[PDB]
Structures are given as structure tokens and as C-alpha cells.
Amino acid sequence: DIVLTQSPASLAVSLGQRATISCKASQSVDFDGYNYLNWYQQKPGQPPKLLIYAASNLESGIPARFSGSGSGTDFTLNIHPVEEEDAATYFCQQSNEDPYTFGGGTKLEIK
Amino acid sequence: DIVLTQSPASLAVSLGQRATISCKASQSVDFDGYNYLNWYQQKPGQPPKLLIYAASNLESGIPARFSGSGSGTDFTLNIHPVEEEDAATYFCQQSNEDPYTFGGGTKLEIK
Amino acid sequence: DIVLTQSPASLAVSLGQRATISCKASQSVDFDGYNYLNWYQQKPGQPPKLLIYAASNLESGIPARFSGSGSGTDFTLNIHPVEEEDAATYFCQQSNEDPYTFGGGTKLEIK
Amino acid sequence: QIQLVQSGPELKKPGETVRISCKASGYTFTKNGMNWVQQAPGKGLKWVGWINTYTGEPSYADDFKGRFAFSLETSASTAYLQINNLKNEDMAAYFCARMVRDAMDFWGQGTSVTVS
Amino acid sequence: QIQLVQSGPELKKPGETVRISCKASGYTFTKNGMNWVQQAPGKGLKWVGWINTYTGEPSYADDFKGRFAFSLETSASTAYLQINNLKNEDMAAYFCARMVRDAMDFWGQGTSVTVS
Amino acid sequence: QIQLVQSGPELKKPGETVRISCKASGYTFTKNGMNWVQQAPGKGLKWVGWINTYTGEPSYADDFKGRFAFSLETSASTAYLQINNLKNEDMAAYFCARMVRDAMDFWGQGTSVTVS
Amino acid sequence: NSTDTVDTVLEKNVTVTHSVNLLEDSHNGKLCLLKGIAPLQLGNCSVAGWILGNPECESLISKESWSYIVETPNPENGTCYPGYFADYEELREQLSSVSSFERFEIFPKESSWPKHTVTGVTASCSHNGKSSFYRNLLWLTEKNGLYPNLSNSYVNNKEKEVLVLWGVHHPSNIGDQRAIYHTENAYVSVVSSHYSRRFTPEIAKRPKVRGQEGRINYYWTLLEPGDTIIFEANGNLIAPWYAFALSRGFGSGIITSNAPMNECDAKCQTPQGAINSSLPFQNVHPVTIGECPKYVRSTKLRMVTGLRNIVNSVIEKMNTQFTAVGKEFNKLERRMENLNKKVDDGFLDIWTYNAELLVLLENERTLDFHDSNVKNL
Amino acid sequence: NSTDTVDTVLEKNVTVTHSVNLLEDSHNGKLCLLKGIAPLQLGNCSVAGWILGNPECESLISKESWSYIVETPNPENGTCYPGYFADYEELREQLSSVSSFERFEIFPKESSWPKHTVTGVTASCSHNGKSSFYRNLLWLTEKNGLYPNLSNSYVNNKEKEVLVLWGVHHPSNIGDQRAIYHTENAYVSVVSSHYSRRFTPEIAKRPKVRGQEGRINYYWTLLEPGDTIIFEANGNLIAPWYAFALSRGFGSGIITSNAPMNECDAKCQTPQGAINSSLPFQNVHPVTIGECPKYVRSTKLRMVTGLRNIVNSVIEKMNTQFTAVGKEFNKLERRMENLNKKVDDGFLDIWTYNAELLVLLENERTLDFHDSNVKNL
Amino acid sequence: NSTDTVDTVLEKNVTVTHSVNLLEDSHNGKLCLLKGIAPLQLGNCSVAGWILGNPECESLISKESWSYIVETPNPENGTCYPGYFADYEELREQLSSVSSFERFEIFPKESSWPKHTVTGVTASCSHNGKSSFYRNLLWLTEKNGLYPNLSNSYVNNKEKEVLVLWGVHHPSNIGDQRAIYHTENAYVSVVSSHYSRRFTPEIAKRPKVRGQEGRINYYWTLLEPGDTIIFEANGNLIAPWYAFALSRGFGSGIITSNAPMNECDAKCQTPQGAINSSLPFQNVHPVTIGECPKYVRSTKLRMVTGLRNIVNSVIEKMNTQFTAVGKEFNKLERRMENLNKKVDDGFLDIWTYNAELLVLLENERTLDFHDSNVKNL
Ligand SMILES: *[C@@H]1O[C@H](CO)[C@@H](O[C@@H]2O[C@H](CO)[C@@H](O)[C@H](O)[C@H]2NC(C)=O)[C@H](O)[C@H]1NC(C)=O
Ligand SMILES: *[C@@H]1O[C@H](CO)[C@@H](O[C@@H]2O[C@H](CO)[C@@H](O)[C@H](O)[C@H]2NC(C)=O)[C@H](O)[C@H]1NC(C)=O
Ligand SMILES: *[C@@H]1O[C@H](CO)[C@@H](O[C@@H]2O[C@H](CO)[C@@H](O)[C@H](O)[C@H]2NC(C)=O)[C@H](O)[C@H]1NC(C)=O
Ligand SMILES: *[C@@H]1O[C@H](CO)[C@@H](O)[C@H](O)[C@H]1NC(C)=O
Ligand SMILES: *[C@@H]1O[C@H](CO)[C@@H](O)[C@H](O)[C@H]1NC(C)=O
Ligand SMILES: *[C@@H]1O[C@H](CO)[C@@H](O)[C@H](O)[C@H]1NC(C)=O
Ligand SMILES: *[C@@H]1O[C@H](CO)[C@@H](O)[C@H](O)[C@H]1NC(C)=O
Ligand SMILES: *[C@@H]1O[C@H](CO)[C@@H](O)[C@H](O)[C@H]1NC(C)=O
Ligand SMILES: *[C@@H]1O[C@H](CO)[C@@H](O)[C@H](O)[C@H]1NC(C)=O
Ligand SMILES: *[C@@H]1O[C@H](CO)[C@@H](O)[C@H](O)[C@H]1NC(C)=O
Ligand SMILES: *[C@@H]1O[C@H](CO)[C@@H](O)[C@H](O)[C@H]1NC(C)=O
Ligand SMILES: *[C@@H]1O[C@H](CO)[C@@H](O)[C@H](O)[C@H]1NC(C)=O
Ligand SMILES: *[C@@H]1O[C@H](CO)[C@@H](O)[C@H](O)[C@H]1NC(C)=O
């Protein structure tokens, strides 16, 4: 199973900072130049919400301050400018090989 | 001329042994993966008899205890199980370049 | 600009000698195996006369004692047998890149 | 507009079975798969499996093989997840989500299964 | 048979302009270009430029750009070279020659321009 | 069934000529060649040569060139070997054999030529 | 009496008493059955998506016998991974006589390719949100970080022609060629008794078609009964999974139509609808399947029966069937496309003039043989 | 009365009183205008010398709209550098429907190819004594002693088909390949959305054609509107300079003729001369452009009008136009050339027998309907 | 009187007094001579075995002039070494107009290839038990353990087209490629003035055809008069020995027939037998050679001469000759094979309906012109 390790555990960010959330897979999650890494956002008491699908395309309905990039095994999620409504937990999820595997999560707390 | 040397001179064999008659050509007697080496058997007072043509195919009318193999310059004739009616002299003959050249002969005497 | 240096300055030749006039270009004056070097002859008080075009073909109307050869940057003009009417000045001229460039000249004086 | 409504929260004892529903609406039920994601509060999300809505063929992870079983009702737009039978482990929330582009974009409201 | 006859010799003062002619005959004036070669006695031949007789488009060397200007008269077979204006340099002979195979095979009689 | 019968044994003096026959039967005489193999008792088999039955063109080894000469009679099925003339060497047996697949599968009864 | 009229050689619009209309101009605009055997309905699939086994054309895998093949104009799902299809229009001519299949495995997965993994899926051929691949082809990838050489034979025991299909991957980067196949100079060599070809990938960056900048070129061949095909590759092979034992039929074909499918019985079929008639000629469409009237480019063709108030010789000799829709030829075959449209429109105008003149000839001989006996009596 | 005669089914040379001649057999032997729009006159140029932009065909660069294209038989100036032309006869079928150009630059020189020099001239394409090259192609050479890799795209903004033309150099020595391109294993890869090909030079010594022992093979493609073509090479590329936005027309074509150009007005045009007539048929030439009579291989075809002294049914049904001169097919296409000459000569003999028999039928019915009323009165 | 009958437009089986039968339906089932010139009889040889010079087709080497070529259906001896034949069906169209040869040596052995041995024989082409090779090709092998590069030109002095034939060996092992040619990356480059191609071997293990797992692909070209062809190779070349100066004729062709050869004289010839008649039409076979009747698909076609008891207009307009047997096209040419069978069967049904209707028209006009004068008298 492709195990993914989020980094860091949770990051301290003020409004106007650049929040960088990263996860590094054990194996490669691409095939034929298609990175299969999705990024999810979960506010507590709510289902997770898909932001970025595989691995840089942004889903319609998500504000353009979210952007992610990376290839192979190393991927990052970059948020700037950090508005106050982004107080959630962030997961990354692979779709290359079954079973699908999530991250550990990362709380974005805002000062 | 491709000169062929039989080995050994003549072999002592009992009924049930494995008789190995070998001849090694000076040049190569194959072209396009077709070994041109024929094997003949001559009982005394009789014409020689074709057993194996070029260099592993067995002729129809010959018992299946005869089998030969080899490629390039080194070929062997293997007889097992040696019945008593194989008391003859064995020749190998090339058909690659003109003139055709025979061996020296090898008497198969049975104990 | 391709600068061409005639060699020698002027040569002393008797009737029956072999006159060798040479010019060496700074860059290469060929492209796709076509040397663009023309050879001209000027008697004083007269226009120059094209002898050999690019770089070994002889023009119609010129006697066959003239012959030139060479490739790349080094070319020679060879005259044998040297008749007396060849008392002129000899130029070589490139046609590869614009502007066209001539030599310095070489007087063929006959003893 | 796309929506996946689920059943209410359930309270069971370890030894009986639960059945979770997921009523899809706003789109064609076939032409899109149906994930099942287990959120255990204090551990994180885990992928139970996926059911093809066109075929009916489930595919489970090995940690969820044997007890968890997906079902369909394509006459309406409803998918089912049945556990046989509940331990005091897998006391968690269960989301039903939708495959669009190797992803889970439209999720459910969550079914809090409490094992007492 | 091919022939290029020119004008006679000219005598100018440094400051006025000269115009040289070159009357071609025996061949079609277009389908062959027209070089202009400057022979200064004591220095050697130099290439002024080339004029396309079909197009009319001149092409000069940079040492002859600005003052020397070629012209045409294709109604007859005549090419022109005008210098604007003569210094006490370019006191030379001026040959008009013909392009056949990247070469200058048929030349003119020479126009001795003397600057006094 | 295929058979090649020969002539009887011959007794000559060194200086005259012998002619050996080989009457083929049971197959078409053309479409198959005809070897000639010399068995000298005490030395082993040697290849005299080969004659094309369709063409008529012989091909000898150089040790058998000049004296040994093959002939044909395709009206019947008979091949001939004539030696011109016998020494006290080549006192041997002479087999006529058949080309099928670069080989000599059907041989003759042997013609013991004794030179006295 | 009546108001029906006929046309003749010299005069036209002659009012007569009786007439037989030799034109069936109407049709029920549906795709009914042919005798009792239902057609094949590709729907939103090409021919290329059906034999390659598209993930969205799984409902046609089960059907292996038909009356005719119905393709829709501009069919969306076929060749989901972009790339060429070597002799695609030639294969449609082969499948226009095939009346039955036998979809079997040549090289059975999970037994046929050791030392390789057969789980190669792409996001262009996605089925129910998850990325998938063709149902009749296998994308072989690495196993344990090694892609060794392969070799597999297949002797045709099926007593019929076997249509083998494969493909060669053409990547977009050289860092993607090394990531999948671990070699940069790869080859595919597919040899047979009367077939031999060697393929080599071409790594180049393409415009994005369906999201991919790499291509897969699809090839095919036809095995003879008793024959052997030998696959061999160093990399870049999309391997054969399934193939088809071909059973040839005489009355069949591929029609292109947008008509709704009904449950009828018919004897004829056109791309606009079936025909139930006993009349000799028709106006509906030249492309017919089944026993059908003959196509003439006419509107009014009646043979007079009675006096005026003040044909098997042509049907026996037509014997040609037109199959041209515009899908038959290529970008680089326009001299043969214009030649096929000259032959097809030429025989549709000779046999329309022949059928009209025979009616014009028989109409004047009928009207004066009937007016012969008015003066005998 | 008069001396005109008609032919009938049973008897011939029947002396009659009046006749209408249905054959226009004469023509003014010139290439007049079509309505008011002047044709394109290539003169001493091929089709291949015109789109490649020969240095001796510069007078046709300015003309971008025409009625028809006039090529001379055995045209001398075209393809000045020797070499193949990939699908040359297929491109002439494309340009036989093009009625307008827009000659524009795809890759503008002096802005489009940095790190390369575009001054590559050859002595086979010499113009006014100086060596030149094609007007629509660029021979890229080294710059500062380096030939690096190239890459250029072009997205089709023109809302029309764009005919792109390029070429690959095939030298004669390996010491000439290193002198120009500085690499020995070079490639050219021209990819698109529905086009992909990779070219590799072939260094060999050829017989001297126009003085050169090396070849340049010329290729082409047709960009769709909204599509992208990507050129990429390591060497040996003769790069595209100009290209053509294609505007398709219905009535056009390439005729081959030696006729003098005049300033007329006409309605029809043949390779032997224009036709001004209202008669139904003709004898001049089968290859016609414009609204024209129909070609029959006849010499005498009259329809009788009056008594003897002692046709839209065929014209509506011909509807075919012949374009074959002998330039349409290849060395290695003779089974299709003999098939095109069988179809063309077959329809010219069916429709000549049909047109003659209808005159033979209408002549006996006219002569006996006229001799019907002589005994009523 | 007699019992012969005719058919008419309205009525049929009309008993009449006299008739002329316009159908020659019988033939002597043999291959007689054409005027006095005997045909070429390949026997158990293909076309491919005859020009490559099979070892079992040596009796046709001596014959260099013929009336027509007779091939047997399913001919066994041709292409003895297995492999492709590039444009084989195109070369049969070239040899269907050739009426004379001149078999000469381009590259004379024992003088033309120094530093190589020309004694390369294979066991698939065995002649009289000994292995042999083709009579018109040379298999070059090593000499003194070295295979150096080769180069040979040939300028066409023969004032005629010269058909050059060669081949490229494709081995089965890489240990066999090194054993014969001593190089692993070999090439063959055959260039000319208007021909240029480069060949590269493909080493793969094939199914055993005639005992060999390696192939030889055979190529050809046509030299123009005054032209030069330059052969050049590093290995894998089966070199040209003999070639043919081609003399073209108008009335010739390749027929496929099993008929016995006789010594006759004839004027016509079909694959079923010769025809000695003066009748206009025939039923025997459409493929004819010589001056022959015209083929109609009829059984009964008589023109009435006399009263009943109680044609050059069609022959001038046919002018087409059919050469299709089924050997004309390929595996991958079925859209052109079905197009050729549509054109051939279309002209055989238009001209059968035209020939029958003209008899039907002339029969009613004869019977009523004869019954015209019975009431005048
Ligand atoms: C099957 O066809 C559908 C169309 O019927 C394809 O779906 C389209 O996919 C493209 C992206 O490639 C989208 O832009 C379109 O909006 C989609 N259309 C619809 C109606 O969904 C689908 O990708 C095809 N799939 C396969 C496997 O070929
Ligand atoms: C254009 O055509 C002319 C012929 O019209 C070519 O000129 C010929 O060139 C050859 C040498 O290649 C000479 O042998 C002939 O004598 C020339 N003929 C004439 C009448 O000049 C010319 O080379 C062609 N040029 C181009 C650019 O294609
Ligand atoms: C010429 O044709 C004959 C057939 O006429 C070939 O002989 C056959 O060879 C195969 C082996 O390849 C045998 O299995 C058949 O039994 C043979 N048939 C007969 C009747 O002999 C022969 O190989 C061909 N030779 C050449 C040079 O093409
Ligand atoms: C016959 O009637 C039709 C009615 O549409 C008309 O078009 C046609 O011209 C008429 N023909 C004649 C010859 O009266
Ligand atoms: C074809 O595709 C459209 C859009 O996906 C869909 O609505 C329709 O039902 C499809 N038709 C078939 C025959 O599947
Ligand atoms: C054709 O029409 C007839 C008469 O209406 C009807 O009896 C018959 O069922 C029809 N045939 C079919 C196939 O429906
Ligand atoms: C009619 O006259 C022409 C004159 O050239 C002649 O050739 C033809 O044979 C004549 N036909 C008949 C039947 O009189
Ligand atoms: C064609 O070429 C010949 C010879 O160069 C020339 O005389 C003639 O004027 C040319 N014609 C055209 C149309 O340019
Ligand atoms: C055609 O001929 C007529 C009558 O002579 C004349 O009036 C007319 O101008 C001609 N048409 C053209 C295009 O010249
Ligand atoms: C004429 O006789 C033949 C005899 O075979 C018969 O088949 C045909 O039907 C008859 N035709 C008529 C109209 O009597
Ligand atoms: C054809 O081959 C068969 C079998 O080898 C043979 O019997 C026959 O005589 C051959 N015919 C010819 C024309 O050589
Ligand atoms: C033979 O050809 C090869 C490939 O073109 C070349 O590398 C080699 O140098 C050549 N040998 C000679 C002797 O020219
Ligand atoms: C054709 O038949 C006639 C009459 O029987 C005969 O005289 C003639 O010799 C035949 N022709 C040939 C070529 O045998």
C-alpha cells in the first residue's frame, strides 16, 4: 500500500501568510504523466471537500488562492493569501493503486 | 576441402550401452542454420545406408534408437539401446561445399 | 567578409613550366558540395576574363591547358604548358556570401 | 444540483448488524461510482471500498473484507453498506462519496454509528 | 553574340555627380543580373554591388552604400550606376558584368572616371 | 519401390577402359541426381562426382578429373561411369547413389572392378 | 373514370384508366428486425471502439450474432486513447461480411504473461469515474522494477480466421518511457507465416487530444486456420487479451442511421427505415440490406394497364449493392473516394435512364395495341 | 428543298426537309475568361513549383483568386532541387477544388527562428544568375558554428484549412552532413492532433539530377481550424516560411493545355478552347469547366423536324465530369490508372450509345407521325 | 418450315421462318496458337518464380517472345525462399503488356563482385536433390572471412526499360547474421535518378515456411533509358545477376487456365478454350485475347430474318477488356477489389441489357415491316 506522510503535523499561520502543506508518498503515484493525488479539506462536523484533483487542477467552486503542484512522490499545497475561513484539516489522497490511501491530516489554525 | 575426423577410431560397446560416435569438421558445414552433415552405416559386403540427414533429422525406415545432434563443426551420433544388429562401420559426410567429403569410419563391435 | 589571400605575390615561369597560383579563403566557400570560387584573368588595359567557374569547371572558349581544383578553403590554379600569351594577372573570387570578394592578383611573367 | 443524503445516526450493541443508506439525487445513478469512506474520530479517514453502480461489482480493501458488504438499489438512486456484524471497533462516521475523476467530490452528510 | 558596351571616359571635379551606362545586347536583359566591379589601378578589383534586372532590387556592399546607386532601363537593355557625389577617392575604372552561374563572365569595356 | 541395379564385376588390365552401368527403377530418372562413390577396401569412401540427370552436366572432384567421365541414357533409366584408362590404382568398388536432400539415400549393389 | 396518369416517349401526362405504381416511396422510419434476427446496435460507439472493446461499450461484448451493424453518424465513444488505427477503413470492409463472432482469449491474463503486470489503466478510458482500459487489450507494465523481454505464440486451432488486435505505445517524454518500460530503444516485432512487421516508438510531444500528449497506434491482422503468430517485444506493447474467430456471411453490412429501434419483422432495411412492399423499384435509399426493391432516382414511374380516356429484364440485370456512406475512405484517399462516387453515381443514372425508358417504351406499345382493336371491332 | 439528312434505326441517310444539329464541334482555340474572372496560368511551372514557390515562378505569388488552373504539358520549372514529393498527385486533387488562397507566413523569418541562419541557397534554384531557394520554404543552417534543436508551434487562427509544406534534406556525403548540420544521427518530427510522422535522413550518393547528388523530399499536411502543428528537429529541416489558408469552391479544376491566352468572355472551357453555344452535346473534349454541353463520341447527330422528301432525359442523367489527363496517377499506381481509364471510357460509351439511340428512336417516331396525317388528309 | 424462335419486346417465343444466331457458345477446350506465335506456358510456376528465375523453372529461361502468358491456378513453384514481394501485383500489371524480353546480365558474375563469394545456396530452392538458388539473383557471402562494403552502378545502354530485381535477407538469429555477413547493423541502399530507398534487416524468429525461419523480401524497379542505378550495401544483399530489357506490346495479357496445350491456329483465346467464329457475341468467358466476339451474359439471342409462321452500334461501343481473375489484388486491398468487381460486373450487365434490347427492338420492327407488305399486296 502507498503510505502517505503529511508534513508538518499542523502549521501556525496568520492572515496574509503563505501556508505550505506537503505530503510525500512511499511509491510513485503517477502513470503516463498523470499524477493521481487529490487534496481534500474538512471542517469539523462536516464532510471533506475536494479542492484540487490530480494533482494541480483546481475544481470548479473553489477559490483560486488554492494551488498545488508536484510530481512523482513529492507534492505540496500552497495557500496564499490565507483568509480566515480556512480553519480546517487538510488531507491528501492517492488514486493510483487500490486501495486508496489518505494522509494523516494537518490543521490550519489562523492567528 | 572440409576434412572430417571421426572420433574414436572404433569403440567397444556391450548390449545396453550408449555408443557415441563423433566427427569434427575443419571448417563450418552450416549455412543459414542448416547443418549439412549426413550419417551413414555400412555393413561389410553391402552398400552404406543413410540414417540421419543434415544433421538431426532421422530418415524414414530407420529405428528411433539412432539420434544425432550438433551444430557448427562438432557433431555426435548416439546409439542407445545398442541392439546386436548394429555391428557396422559408421561414416559422417558433409554436403556444404563441393567436393563432398566422408569420414574415416568407426566400427561398432558388440561384446 | 571572406578575405582571400593569393599566393605567391607573382611567379617567374618559363615557356613549358608548370605555373601554380593558389588562394586560401578565411572561411569556407562551399555549401552542399558546391565550391563557389571563380578564377579570372586580366590582361592590362582590358576587362578580366572568366576562365574557371566554381571551382573546377572550365568555361567554353578557354583552352584546356587551364585547370583548377581544391575544396573547402584551399584552391589552386595550374597552367601547363605555359604558352607566351598568358602574360596577365590572375584573380580568384568567391560567390558564397555577400559581398563578393576578389583576391590580390598574381602576375604571370614569362621568361 | 448534486446531493447525497444518508440515513440518521444509529446506536447498536456489539453483535448485531447495521445498514446505512445513501440516497443520491440530481444526476444519473449509473455513470458514476460510489465510494465509502470511514472517518473514525481520532484516527483519520480510511477507504472501505468502491461499488460500481453500472455493474454492481464491489471492490473492498483487505481490512474491510469479510464483514463490510456493499449493495445497490438502482431503481431509485440508493446505495447501501451493511456490516456483519459490528465490533466495538469501527465505531465511526461513514461517508458515501462519488467517483468523477478518480476522486471523491460530492460526499454525504455522515452517519454516526455508535456501538454501545 | 553577347556584348556590353559602356559610355566613354569622364572627367569630373570632387563635388558633382557622374552617371555610367552599360548597353547590353545579344541576349535577354532580364533572366540575367548585372554586377558592378570597381577596378582602382594600384589596388585591385572590388565588388560594388548587384542589381536584379527582373526585379529591380539592388544590393550593395556596405563600403558602397549611400553614394553608389544602381538604376535600370529595361525598355532598352541599359543599366546605370550613379555616384552622389564623387570624392577624390573612387577615381577608378568601372566594369559592368553579367551573372550566369554565380560569376561574371561577360564584362564591359571599362569607364575610366578621373576626378580632377 | 526404389532400386538401383548395377553391372557385374569386371576384370581388366592396366591400360584398357571399363564402363559401369546403373539401372534405376521405381522413380522418375530426372528430378533426382546421381552420385558416384568410390569405396576402396582399406581406405574408405571417396566422392567421385555428381551428374545432373535433368541437365546432363557433370561435376567432378579434382582427383577424379580427366579420366573419370559420367554419361547418361535417360531414354531408359541408366547412368554410366567410364574410366579412361585404368591404372593399378582405383582398383575399388563403385556405388551409384541418389540425391534427395543433399544426401545419398538409395545406393547400388556395388561394382567390384579388379585390375590385373 | 380515375385520374391516374402515365408518361410516354413523345407525349406526357396522358390521362388513362388504370395504372400500376412501380415505386415504393414510403417507409416506417425505424430499425426493425431482418427476418427474426435482431441487428447489432453500436449506439454511442464506433467500429473501432467495439472491437478494441471500449470501457463504455461493454453491453455489446455479450452479443455475437446479428443481422447487420448499425453505427450512428458522428459516434462519440471509440478509440479512447488517442492514436492512429492502421488500416481502419480496410477492417470495416472485413467486418461488413462477418455475421458471427467467437470472442475468446488468445493470451489469457493471469497465466499468460509472467514477469509482467497487466494492470495498466489510463484516465482517457475512464469507466464510472475510475480510470480503466480496453476490454480486449492489455497494457503490460513493469514487475518488481524490471521489464524483461517477452515472447508468446498462438497456433490457430479454431478452424476459422482469427482477428488479432494489438497496439504500440508512443510516449510523450523520454522520462516517461524510462518510467514505464525502463528502456529507451524498444521494439515490437509481430511475425507470422505471411506477416512480418517491426515497430519502434516515436517519442514526441503532441497536442493534447483527450488530455494525453502520447499516442497508441492500433494494428490488426487475420490469422489463417492452422497458422501461428509470434509476439515479441522489449517494451511499448499493448498486448492482445481477446480475439475473434470470424464467421463470414453473405447478406450483411454496416449501415449508418439515426433511426429508432423498434421490434418489427421486415424483409428489407435502409438507413431511413424498413420497407414492406412487393413493388419493383424504390426511392428511399440506395444502401439496402435484405431482399429489397431496386433504387431509381425517380419520382413518377407508372406502367399503363388499360385504354386512355380523352420490367423483369431490368431487375435481373442490376445486381449491384452500394455501401458508401463517407466512412469508407481516408484523408489521403480522395482519388479513390472520387472514383467510388463516380462509379456509384454513374450506375445510379444509367439504371435510372434504363428503367425509365423501358416504362416509356412499354407505355406507347400498350396504348396503341389497345387502340389497335378499336378499329378491328 | 434542303440537303440535310438524318439517321434512323432501320435505314440511314434519310433525306429530309429540316433538321436541328445537336453537336457543337467547333471552338475558338484560346483560353478565354470564365465569367469575368481570369484563370490562373502557371506557364512554365508545375503545380509543385507553384506551391513550393519556385524562384522562376514569382509572378504567380501575387495572384490568389482564379477560375481554373492552366498547366502546360511537360512543364519545366518545378521542384528545382531534386527529390520526392510525398503524395504529390493527392495534393493536386486537393488543389482542384481550391478557388482562393491566403498566402501568409506561419513561421515569420527574422523573428521566428533564433539561433539559426535562414540564408541557405542552392545552385539548382538559381534566379537571374545568382543561386536562390524556394519562396515558401527556408533552409535553416548553422549559426556561430552550432546547430541546436528547434521547436515551433502554430495554432490555426485562420478559421480555414491551412496547407503546411516542409522538406527534409538527404545529403550525399557524411562529410557534408557534418558540415551543415553538425550531427550524423538527425531527425525531423512533425506532429499534430491527427498527424504524426518522424523523418530520418538517408545519406547516399545519387545520380546527378540538376547537378546535385543529394535529395530533398517534400511533405505536406492540412491543418484543421483550431488545430496545432509542432515542428521539431535536430537537423536536416527545410522549414516552412509561407502557407495557404484554403478556400474551397465547387466549379474549378486543373486543365492541361497549350492554347494561347486571350481576353474573351465565355461560359464553357476545354483544353482545346472555349465553347459559345446553346446546343446540347459536343465533340471537343470531355474535360470541361463551367456550364457546358455534354460530351459524346459522335460525329453526326441530328433530330428531324419536318417531313422527308423522296433529349433532356439524357442531359439530366449524365452529371459526371472527367478530370483525367495522365498526371493524376503514379509509377506505382497502374492498377488504379487502368481502372480510372476503364470507368471514364466506359461512361463515355454508354452515354454515347444512349444519346445516339434516343435520336434514332425519336427519328422514326417523328417520320411516321408526320406520315400519319398524310392519309388522314 | 423450321422450328427456330425469337424473342420480342411484348411477346416471346415467336415461331418464325428464319433466324441468325448471334452467340458463339462453344469452344475447343485447348490453348491453341494466337496467329502463329506460340504462347508462354509457365506450367508449375508463378509469375514470381519466372522472373526471379526459379531452379525448377529453367525451361522458360530460353523463351523470350510470346503471344500471351498462361499461369495455372494455384501454381506451386515460385518464391522458393519465403518472404514478401514488394508490389508483386503491380509488377504483374507491368508484365501484362510486355511482349518480348532480352534476358541479359546487369552485374556479370565472375567479374562483377570482387572480394565476395557468389556461391550461396539454400535447401528450399533445391534442384535435382542438390540445394540451389535463383537463376537471376546472387546471394553474396563472405570471402576470406571478410564481408566488405559494395558498390556497383549500371548505366542503361539498352535503349529500353530495364527491370532490375534484387532482394534483402532477413535472418532468424543474430548468431546467423554474424556468421554470414559479420555485421549486426547492416543496410542496403538502392538509389537511382527517380528512385531512392534504404533497407534494413529485421532479425526475428518466424514460423517455418518451407523449412526456413528467415525471410527474403524481393524488390524491383524499372530503369529508364539512359539512367543509372547504384547498389550499395554493408550486408544482407541478394544481388542482381540477370535482368530484362522490356519490349511493350498492345495485344497480350496473363490468363489463368487449366486447358491442355494443343498445336492449332486461332484468332481468339479464352481461359476455357479458343474461339473460331464470325458471330458478333459470345458466352464463353469475358477475358479474351485477340480479335474476339463480345461477351454478353445471355443464352438466347437471335435476330429474325423472315416472316413468322402462325448490331454494329453495340460492338463499336463496347471497347473494354476484362483481365480480373482474383490474382490482381492483395490481402490489404479489398476496397479496390470490390470496386473492380463492381465496375466489371456493372459493364457486363449494362452491355448485356443494351445488346438484348437492341435485338428486342429490331425483332418487332422486322416482323411488322414484313407484315406491312402483306396488305399492300
Ligand atoms: C465517452 O463519451 C463521452 C461522451 O459521450 C465522453 O464524455 C465527454 O468527455 C469529455 C472529456 O474528454 C468532456 O469534455 C465531455 O463533456 C464529456 N461529455 C459527456 C456527455 O460526458 C467520455 O469521455 C467518453 N469515454 C470514453 C471511455 O471514451
Ligand atoms: C527553369 O527552367 C529552365 C528551362 O526553362 C532551366 O534552364 C535550363 O537549365 C539546364 C541546366 O539545369 C540547362 O541545361 C538548360 O539549357 C536550361 N534551359 C534554358 C532554356 O535555359 C532552369 O534551370 C530552371 N530553373 C529553375 C529554378 O527551376
Ligand atoms: C517445387 O514444387 C514441388 C511441388 O511441385 C515442391 O515439392 C514439394 O516439397 C515439399 C517440401 O517443401 C514436400 O512436402 C512436397 O511433398 C513436395 N511435393 C512434391 C510433389 O514433390 C518443391 O519443393 C518445389 N521446389 C522449388 C524449388 O520451389
Ligand atoms: C405534367 O404535369 C406536371 C405537374 O407537376 C408538370 O410539371 C409537367 O410539366 C407536365 N408535363 C407535360 C408535358 O404536360
Ligand atoms: C449517448 O450519449 C448520451 C450522452 O452521454 C446519452 O444521453 C445517451 O443515452 C447515449 N445513448 C446510448 C445509446 O447509450
Ligand atoms: C406487410 O404488410 C402486410 C399487409 O399490410 C402485412 O400483412 C404484413 O404483416 C406486413 N409485413 C411485416 C413484416 O410487417
Ligand atoms: C451514308 O453516307 C455516308 C457518307 O460518308 C456513308 O459513309 C454511309 O455508309 C452512308 N450510309 C448508308 C446506310 O447509306
Ligand atoms: C517558357 O520558357 C521559354 C524558354 O525559357 C521561354 O522562351 C518562354 O517565354 C517561357 N514562357 C513563359 C510563359 O514564361
Ligand atoms: C456568343 O455568340 C453570340 C452570337 O454570335 C454573341 O452575341 C456573344 O457575344 C457570344 N458570347 C461570348 C461570350 O462571346
Ligand atoms: C419460352 O420457352 C421457354 C422454354 O424453356 C420457357 O422457359 C419460357 O418461359 C417461354 N416464354 C414464354 C413467354 O412463352
Ligand atoms: C507439375 O508438378 C507435378 C508434380 O510434381 C508433375 O507431375 C507435373 O508433370 C508438373 N507439370 C509440369 C507442367 O511440369
Ligand atoms: C561501410 O559502410 C558503413 C556504413 O555506411 C561505414 O560506417 C563504413 O565506414 C563503410 N566502410 C568503408 C570501407 O567505407
Ligand atoms: C475455322 O473453321 C473453318 C471452317 O470449319 C476452318 O476452315 C478453319 O480452318 C478454322 N480456323 C482455324 C484457325 O482452325
Numbering used by the authors:
A (entry chain H), B (entry chain H), C (entry chain H): 1 to 111
D (entry chain F), E (entry chain F), F (entry chain F): 1 to 116
G (entry chain A), H (entry chain A), I (entry chain A): 15 to 324, 382 to 448
Task: Provide passages from the article that reported this PDB entry.
Most broadly neutralizing antibodies (bnAbs) recognize hemagglutinin (HA), the major surface glycoprotein on influenza viruses. HA mediates virus attachment to the host cell through the receptor-binding site (RBS) on the globular head region of HA1. Here, we describe a chimeric monoclonal antibody, C12H5, that offers neutralization against seasonal and pandemic H1N1 viruses, and cross-protection against some H5N1 viruses. Through structural analyses, we show that C12H5 engages hemagglutinin (HA), the major surface glycoprotein on influenza, at a distinct epitope overlapping the receptor binding site and covering the 140-loop.
